[PDB]
Write a protein that binds this ligand. Structure first.
Ligand SMILES: NCCc1ccc(O)c(O)c1
Ligand SMILES: NCCc1ccc(O)c(O)c1
Ligand SMILES: O=Cc1ccc(O)cc1
Ligand SMILES: O=Cc1ccc(O)cc1
Ligand SMILES: O=Cc1ccc(O)cc1
Ligand SMILES: O=Cc1ccc(O)cc1
Ligand SMILES: [Cl-]
Ligand SMILES: [Cl-]
Ligand SMILES: [Cl-]
Ligand SMILES: [Cl-]
Ligand SMILES: [Cl-]
Ligand SMILES: [Cl-]
Ligand SMILES: [Cl-]
Ligand SMILES: [Cl-]
Ligand SMILES: [Cl-]
Ligand SMILES: [Cl-]
Lengths: 155, 173, 173, 155
């Protein structure tokens, strides 16, 4: 038995949905995560070509929670500009979380504007909802949204 | 397939903690001397997987088992702490007092700045003793809600019981 | 199943070596400038698995790709060197001179005390250059029989050819 | 195509073959290798209970060749006091060796004496026989023989 929790973050961007989606769907993005997010990772291992099926093993500096987890690039839908990335090992999965999924959806607003709609769904054992509730936030998705938009806006 | 690894390279805030102590006591029908000799045995560390079967996914022992020894403990998937290092700080034969400090990983990544286990084996009679196992930790006050349910006397109690079982199953010196 | 890891803890002899130098030169129909910009590109390290597909089982890059960067290279089973670390010592733009030192593993476990690669890109004309890649190593004389057949200009020659291919397949700045 | 090479070492011991074999066949021996051979290993990982099927991953200090290899406890014959241990990864297998096997055979001489007969067979590609010939010796087996006999003789 698990409780389902869904959290959301949105970010408006003065660029086309296609220009933002190009970055998010780029297979070369994985190897550029330390450039995009300086000092976020102590260690990042990329297993694969950066496309769907790629696993990322992320290790953070001492003091931070998650210390380490693995993420898998599970699904890309270019038409809908939608990307799914599952946490498959470590991190919150060691604190009663049985399922953890990030979804990013770049939605066009105008011709040269869009909204980055990021969300994370997780399933928790009730014995742990009070423990992990405060730990799980939209931080990682927000950081990505901010960095990608800044990369695209400044050209 | 291809594996690529990319490794980059508050002075009052760090001591802005509250101190918590949790105590465990196991009184057992064996001598302090018999219980202490297991605890103070330098060979104990390498026998932890035997003493506590299915506790560890991986155990690394750095050093000779005496004071200064570091134990790197990795636990099976799903379990919290997944990994941490502990260091043998004190093995005091006269007082039957052992100190073990968590030095990296585990609760130290969840707002805890200091974590020390103390085991004191105290006679209560000629063939009985108390194993007093305690954990003193310092936490940033705003992680007390998070971390208190996780920090229990579980591993210290597990050790006390397993060692007691060994001894009460009367083997010898 | 159970994993247990146990980790314990001549001043003239160490410099009693002979010096060997092996030279490789690739003269190519591209400018020194074009060839150098690839070699001196800080992003080159993270693209080595792309530049040299199937060369590495694992590659770790420690640092930003500039001077000071350490590369930990693990090769597929059966291949010698299985693993070693190299360090970017010099990236000299004025002379088109790059130095890369093997600092741990590989030949350093087979009697070699020092191993330095130097790459110098020299103009031979307006649209041509020589890539002079050399390896200077110091070995204990009694491992020369062992290690000389193993140490070749292979990896330096592989790099020179791969970079040349990239450039000669005329892409841009 | 490979060349076959077999090298041998013998050690006479003033103890019974059974008293020596007891040590060699002891499943607890693996975890006591650093005690038996101080300073031989930088790191020793034991994967298994110490019995047949156990894998040992041995890492040596910088400067030494092999830096690292895995060994597997393949066969025990108690009647004949015979033990087989194969090198399965790393070490000489990265220098044209396609097969590497250690055999230890404790043979009784008298009632309270025996000979420890240790040998290693390997198969090499001819392109590498001159390279690995000087590297492969009975050292590891000799070290084991010396340490076990000393343990048993001194009681
Ligand atoms: N494509 C994965 C991007 C990602 C995942 C987790 C993070 O914590 C982070 O900063 C970035
Ligand atoms: N039972 C394996 C014993 C062993 C194997 C290789 C060695 O190098 C060594 O010193 C000891
Ligand atoms: O690749 C998009 C992404 C960003 C942050 C995450 O946490 C997961 C995926
Ligand atoms: O008895 C000491 C001890 C060692 C390791 C632990 O994890 C706990 C206690
Ligand atoms: O061009 C620099 C260089 C980097 C890594 C190597 O292995 C060899 C050369
Ligand atoms: O266990 C016996 C043994 C000793 C030395 C080896 O190299 C291999 C096995
Ligand atoms: Cl790229
Ligand atoms: Cl973690
Ligand atoms: Cl942990
Ligand atoms: Cl007390
Ligand atoms: Cl007393
Ligand atoms: Cl190597
Ligand atoms: Cl020159
Ligand atoms: Cl010039
Ligand atoms: Cl044992
Ligand atoms: Cl090796």
């Amino acid at each position: 038995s698990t409780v389902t929790k869904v959290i959301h973050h949105e970010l408006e961007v003065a660029a086309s949905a296609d220009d933002i989606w190009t970055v998010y769907s780029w297979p070369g993005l994985a190897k550029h995560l330390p450039d995009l997010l300086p000092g976020a990772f102590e260690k990042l291992e990329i297993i694969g070509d950066g496309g769907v099926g790629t696993i990322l093993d992320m290790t953070f500096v001492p003091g931070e929670f998650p210390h380490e987890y693995k993420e898998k690039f599970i699904l890309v839908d270019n038409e809908h500009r939608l990307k799914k990335v599952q946490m498959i090992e470590g991190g919150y999965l060691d604190l009663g979380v049985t399922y953890y999924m990030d979804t990013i959806h770049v939605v066009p607003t105008g011709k040269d504007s869009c909204v980055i709609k990021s969300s994370t769904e997780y399933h928790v054992k009730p014995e742990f909802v009070k423990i992990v509730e405060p730990l799980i936030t939209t931080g990682p998705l927000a950081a990505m949204a901010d960095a990608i938009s800044k990369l695209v806006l400044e050209h």
